[PDB]
Amino acid sequence: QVQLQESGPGLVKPSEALSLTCSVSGVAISRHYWNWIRQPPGKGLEWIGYIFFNGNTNYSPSLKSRVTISVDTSKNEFSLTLRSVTAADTAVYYCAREKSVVEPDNMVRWFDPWGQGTLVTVSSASTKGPSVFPLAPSSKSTSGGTAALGCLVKDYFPEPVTVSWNSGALTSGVHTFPAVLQSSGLYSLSSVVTVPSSSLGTQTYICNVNHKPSNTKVDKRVEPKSC
Amino acid sequence: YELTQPPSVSVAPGKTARITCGGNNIGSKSVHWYQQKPGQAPVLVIYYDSDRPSGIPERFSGSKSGNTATLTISRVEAGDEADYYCQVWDSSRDHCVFGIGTKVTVLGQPKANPTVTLFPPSSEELQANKATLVCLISDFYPGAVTVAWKADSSPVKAGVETTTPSKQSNNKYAASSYLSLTPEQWKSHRSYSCQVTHEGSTVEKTVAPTEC
């Protein structure tokens, strides 16, 4: 199937250049127009521009002066460069495949599918990868048939961290909370999963923490606590 | 060129919700709709005015008029709470244009009283000379909650951070609160507690340094 996956730096210092790449699976770049959109946190979708492998491009009026979109067919990828960033450029950046039909004298163009988005934070502060600690199940985090267990993901910057359990094999009963922003300017969050209390003596639980801004991955075992 | 939408649409469960999109004589162009649920990418939900992509429920339908384009959701589910965005292309300037977006909330879901889970500092974190109590509040509705922490039945305000509630996969809400402490402070009281107030009633959990 057709999948798109953005990759970015996470953090970008003011006045420097943002560079992103979108890797395309399941179709050749040459077969479609490709677009970049962005979304500031709390706000709406803003188109950036499009490209076609023969060189055609058009960019948003607001951003035309600072944007370059390019294409790499030999890696089935397209890319975005946005120079001279300011805080107004902090946003989730999405790539998307353009679908289009030829209707006379007009343009009918829509997006299907979108990538997952990647958060870009414009900041002078420095990157910091998280510290991860277990939230162990005990005789007091139980509710009869089930127990809650979790991982605490502390003091990272910038957002985001994502968490999976048992390499994605464990999805039922998972909730990853939003981050808190501490007085120190660092974020922390927790992910919890509820599992059978029966299982605790004989099943392994691992939280997979991903902090792409720091190129860090932590796989933390969460074991019953033994006093 | 500009695309206007209502900032929000409220609707009761099972009722029909209608999200409308007005633009420069839209009716000349073609309107597309995207669903964006909290924390996720947009997904296409209607395209070419009224077409449903493969995989979208029939209860999503798109219509148009003269100055307005409409997205209709019959038998609205709490699971359809989302922001919806209309979209067209401007063929003269060669620009894509989005609406400002409409946040749909379904109100009058069943009340759910919160479960509270309180984790003490892990020995691993205490061994790194830090201590964090973690109070997770889940499976509640409506969303408004307040959290208060106590050490030995005396209020604590320093070192507390609390998230605003967010939907879980259940469509019920969840929230979290942290109490940061030194290991010494953790061991110096007999107990700590996290009390959650929801819809005028409270649920409190207690942990003690001396129970494992």
Numbering used by the authors:
A (entry chain H): 1 to 82, 82A, 82B, 82C, 83 to 100, 100A, 100B, 100C, ...
B (entry chain L): 2 to 9, 11 to 95, 95A, 95B, 96 to 106, 106A, 107 to 211
What does the paper say about this structure?
We also solved a 1.7 Å-resolution crystal structure of the ACS122 Fab but was unable to crystallize ACS114 Fab by itself. NS-EM of three Fabs (ACS122, ACS124 and ACS125; one from every timepoint) in complex with the autologous AMC009 SOSIP trimer showed that they bound the gp120-gp41 interface. In addition, the gp120-gp41 interface NAbs ACS122 and ACS125 were less broad and potent and neutralized 8% and 7% of tested viruses with a IC50 geometric mean of 12 and 20 μg/ml, respectively. Moreover, ACS122 contains lower levels of SHM in its HC and LC (24 and 10 nucleotide substitutions respectively) compared to 35022 (96 and 71 nucleotide changes in HC and LC, respectively), and lacks the 8 amino-acid insertion in HC framework 3 that characterizes 35O22. Interestingly, NS-EM and cryo-EM 2D-class averages of ACS122 in complex with AMC009 SOSIP trimer showed that ACS122 induced dissociation of AMC009 trimer into individual gp120-gp41 protomers.
